Amino acid sequence: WDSHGLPANIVVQLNKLSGFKKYKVSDIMFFDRRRQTTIGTEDSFFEMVSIRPGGVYTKAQLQKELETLATCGMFEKVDLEGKTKPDGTLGVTISFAESTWQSADRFRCINVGLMVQSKPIEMDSDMTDKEKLEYYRSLEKDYKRRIDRARPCLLPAPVYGEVMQMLRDQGKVSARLLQRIRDRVQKWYHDEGYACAQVVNFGNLNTKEVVCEVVEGDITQLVIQFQDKLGNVVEGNTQVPVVRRELPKQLRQGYVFNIEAGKKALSNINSLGLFSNIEVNPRPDEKNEGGIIVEIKLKELE
């Protein structure tokens, strides 16, 4: 609830270029352009948008929102605009056009963690007819390559059975079905301890196939931060080896992060009676390819 804002004065409308500051959004509009309707607050397809009425966001944050909607596979075109309100907030309007889909007889899940992320990145048009057909061939071949380069997912058979039953019931895929499929697949991961797992994309490039791209939370780095005491952030320098000892094998780089490994570590380090606080915190790393940095934060006791 720390707010701020400086609209361009006054009631005008702005594409996204501006600001070093954190704006307040008083209303969110979700607009389906092909249907010419507006998504209602009570429609649950609205939580597709993570931006909330009354929330504070920066330019990079709103950019990051649009980025997400554009790469998820559900929309072939998405836009974020804003209108500055007389004071002091702005409303934002997110207008989309759903991706086109056909029937799908197959649901495939591939682990793309640590690979290059699928960017909507649709190249130039016009581009006459035959050159466009050739270009599609390039994409689908690039995409078969991608599928074969990918790893298996951890997703078990009964989840595939639900998703396929789900999909056999609609008979034609839409944005709303994918959302439910996304939540279902993320639910299984989260429920099994993979707290960093995320569905990053849905590919339509395979005929009659839905491809679901996931990152499971691959650990690319393990970092140990010491704090002493009141007070904080020094080296361990004799201590580092003794906390490394307490770490499960599964917390090292090259394993998929799971909260049970985190808990095992916490119980192990706690049994040393060295620290007044112990925390195992996963966060995304540099590459934005689904890599996880595990940092163990240790505060010493008086």
Side-chain angles (χ1 to χ4, degrees), residues 2-5 7-8 11-12 15-19 23 25-41 43-82 84-86 88-101 104-120 128-130 133 135-136 138-140 142-227 231-234 236 238-252 254-259 261-285 288-301:
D2 222 28
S3 174
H4 180 256
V11 204
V12 91
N15 293 319
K16 339 159 49 53
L17 297 72
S18 45
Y23 311 81
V25 196
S26 51
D27 76 270
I28 325 300
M29 198 163 91
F30 208 19
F31 186 78
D32 182 348
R33 294 162 74 209
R34 196 162 287 154
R35 269 187 175 82
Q36 305 279 17
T37 340
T38 270
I39 299 306
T41 163
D43 199 44
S44 86
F45 182 60
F46 183 86
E47 44 195 343
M48 210 58 213
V49 181
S50 58
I51 304 305
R52 287 291 178 281
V56 283
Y57 304 96
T58 61
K59 171 182 171 55
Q61 286 190 295
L62 285 183
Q63 207 80 236
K64 181 62 138 52
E65 173 73 5
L66 180 64
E67 187 265 325
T68 310
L69 289 167
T71 72
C72 64
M74 285 175 218
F75 316 100
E76 42 182 307
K77 295 275 155 61
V78 58
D79 265 21
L80 196 154
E81 277 189 342
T84 137
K85 299 226 175 185
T89 69
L90 30 68
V92 316
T93 285
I94 297 168
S95 62
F96 62 92
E98 286 189 35
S99 291
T100 316
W101 301 80
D105 314 323
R106 182 178 299 227
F107 175 73
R108 190 183 284 285
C109 199
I110 60 171
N111 173 4
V112 296
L114 270 36
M115 306 177 49
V116 276
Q117 289 296 274
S118 286
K119 264 282 193 172
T128 72
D129 200 280
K130 195 206 189 83
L133 273 46
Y135 176 72
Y136 185 90
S138 151
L139 286 170
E140 191 181 3
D142 284 335
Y143 203 77
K144 299 306 184 38
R145 271 186 186 79
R146 179 163 175 99
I147 274 145
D148 271 39
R149 198 171 98 183
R151 284 176 291 158
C153 302
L154 292 164
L155 197 80
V159 184
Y160 283 85
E162 291 185 40
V163 170
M164 280 285 295
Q165 190 80 4
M166 237 176 185
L167 212 150
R168 274 191 272 249
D169 288 328
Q170 269 215 14
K172 187 192 190 212
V173 251
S174 66
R176 287 181 202 266
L177 181 60
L178 291 181
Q179 170 188 44
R180 299 205 270 104
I181 288 179
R182 193 235 257 141
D183 282 26
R184 181 49 190 118
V185 172
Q186 289 188 161
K187 193 208 180 338
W188 176 87
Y189 276 96
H190 296 348
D191 288 9
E192 283 300 302
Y194 301 104
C196 288
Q198 213 182 356
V199 162
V200 289
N201 183 257
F202 290 102
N204 57 358
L205 271 185
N206 286 25
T207 50
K208 301 298 192 88
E209 208 169 348
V210 179
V211 173
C212 174
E213 290 186 26
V214 315
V215 296
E216 305 191 315
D218 299 292
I219 301 177
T220 65
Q221 189 170 347
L222 170 79
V223 167
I224 306 169
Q225 165 190 5
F226 285 91
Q227 297 189 12
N232 47 79
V233 71
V234 298
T238 197
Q239 304 227 279
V240 187
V242 329
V243 295
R244 276 219 131 87
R245 282 208 287 277
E246 301 304 323
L247 306 183
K249 194 50 167 53
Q250 300 79 13
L251 271 193
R252 322 221 184 290
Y255 294 83
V256 158
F257 176 82
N258 192 283
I259 58 170
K263 288 165 177 180
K264 205 156 303 175
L266 185 148
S267 265
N268 289 339
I269 300 169
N270 258 333
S271 66
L272 298 168
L274 274 10
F275 312 105
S276 76
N277 211 271
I278 306 171
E279 212 170 343
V280 178
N281 292 332
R283 66 186 159 95
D285 60 7
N288 282 309
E289 304 201 344
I292 286 316
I293 288 172
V294 175
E295 61 192 60
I296 286 90
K297 251 154 68 83
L298 313 154
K299 185 172 143 83
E300 311 208 330
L301 44 53

